[PDB]
Design a protein around this ligand. Structure first.
Ligand SMILES: O=C(/C=C/c1ccc(O)cc1)O[C@H](Cc1ccc(O)cc1)C(=O)O
Length: 407
């Protein structure tokens, strides 16, 4: 019940010199065809001209005068050609209050499908969706190429794109586009054995069912430790709950994958624009997860995160430097599946700070993903001090997963 209205490609207003620049080694840790995408929801207010299209286009140009690589040898890079940034405005016969709590069920008309079979550099790298409803509310669906930038950089871009629409100046440190700070050493000397690069522990006794279910949970009972970060304890609990709810045989290896922003532990320049996301991979058998205390799992995840010191991160970069190709090491879409698990945390991220001049977001959230195996941590826009756990799991296991509440 959604249909396209307009499809535009936006140039910057200024020149923005478009010399192609170098992608990092961590940027090459994704498939050549992948968009990470989420949606921003805005409810209508008493103000006239709620998200006018022309104002947003002439604000998008004033935003692209800084972030020009969004419009644009044997190694991946797409030149800043300044030819266009896809912006498709749609129309829906819907009421935003009928959504209720925004379960991201796969009715993907809030975003478009892209085709890079015609060319990997033919179409641009990011797409925005401005879909307007019957109630006057609007959904803004963002879809970004992971090679170009991570969630932090695209979030900073959307915050600049917010401040330059509300008549305010640029948000913080202006974006830095030279990724030479994430370059390998000279010479490259790895010093550790990296399990973030070894293949995931698949090949278990096969699964009878394949259909999955998504569930988004509220947990207002964070304020208890039954003897570490909040994230480490919570991730240990989620991981133990999943490994118990799956009923896998003891001796089956499970592997938790955790994104980790390497801007702080390393010395990255401010406004660094690109992927600075490493991986924290603690491995353990499902038995010793289910047959030991929560202390075991939380210590395992804490050792998985605390290993990522400066030496280990630079050694990982040098290990990537030693490789033939790096995109052959990028696991995904099959690493996601059981017995493996992802857990992220958007609680610390400023995902609600984008205010275009019409108010804050009622709800932003992920949409349309390779679903199973990925647990997310979100903040509640009700700001009751509560926290959301958005997980996807096979149906046989989602009902078992209710022991997350059992401390
Ligand atoms: O969760 C985020 C969200 C990104 C985002 C934030 C705000 C926006 O407006 C738009 C996108 O990023 C991760 C990326 C990722 C995945 C696996 C890894 O091993 C390393 C990194 C993801 O989407 O899964």
């Amino acid at each position: 019940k959604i249909e396209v209205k307009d499809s535009t490609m936006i140039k910057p207003s200024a020149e923005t010199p478009g010399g192609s620049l170098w992608l990092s080694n961590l940027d090459l840790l994704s498939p050549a065809n992948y968009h990470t995408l989420s949606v921003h929801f805005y409810s209508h207010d008493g103000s006239d001209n709620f998200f006018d299209a022309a104002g947003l286009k002439e604000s998008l140009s004033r935003a692209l005068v800084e972030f020009y690589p969004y419009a644009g040898g044997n190694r991946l890079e797409i030149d800043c050609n300044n030819e266009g940034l896809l912006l498709v405005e749609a129309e829906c016969d819907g009421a935003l209050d009928e959504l209720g709590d925004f379960a991201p069920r796969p009715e993907l008309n809030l975003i478009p499908k892209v085709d890079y079979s015609r060319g990997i550099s033919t179409y641009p790298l990011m797409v925005f969706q401005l879909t307007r409803f019957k109630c006057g509310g609007v959904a803004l669906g963002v879809a970004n190429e992971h090679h170009l930038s991570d969630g932090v950089a695209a979030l900073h871009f959307i915050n600049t794109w917010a401040h330059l629409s509300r008549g305010a100046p640029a948000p913080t440190p202006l974006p830095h586009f030279d990724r030479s700070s994430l370059s390998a050493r000279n010479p490259p000397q790895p010093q550790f054995s990296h399990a973030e690069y070894q293949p995931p522990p698949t090949l278990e006794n096969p699964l009878p069912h394949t259909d999955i279910a998504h569930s988004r949970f509220k947990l207002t009972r964070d304020q208890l430790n039954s003897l570490y970060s909040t994230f480490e304890v919570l991730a240990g609990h989620i991981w133990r709950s999943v490994c118990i709810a799956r009923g896998l045989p003891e001796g089956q290896e499970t592997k938790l994958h955790i994104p980790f922003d390497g801007r702080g532990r390393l010395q990255l320049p401010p406004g660094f624009f690109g992927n600075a996301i490493f991986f924290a991979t603690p491995i353990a058998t499902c038995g010793e997860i289910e047959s030991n205390s929560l202390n075991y799992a939380v210590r395992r995840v804490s050792d998985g995160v605390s290993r990522l010191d400066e030496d280990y991160l630079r050694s990982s970069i040098d290990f990537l430097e030693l490789q033939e190709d790096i995109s052959k090491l990028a696991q995904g879409a099959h690493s996601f599946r059981c017995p493996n698990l992802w857990v992220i945390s958007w609680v610390w991220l400023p995902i609600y700070e984008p205010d275009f001049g019409w108010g804050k977001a009622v709800y932003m959230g992920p949409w349309a993903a390779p679903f199973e195996g990925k647990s997310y941590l979100l903040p509640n826009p009700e700001k009751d001090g509560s926290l959301f756990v958005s997980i996807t799991l096979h149906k046989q296991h989602m009902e078992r997963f209710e022991k997350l509440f059992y401390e």
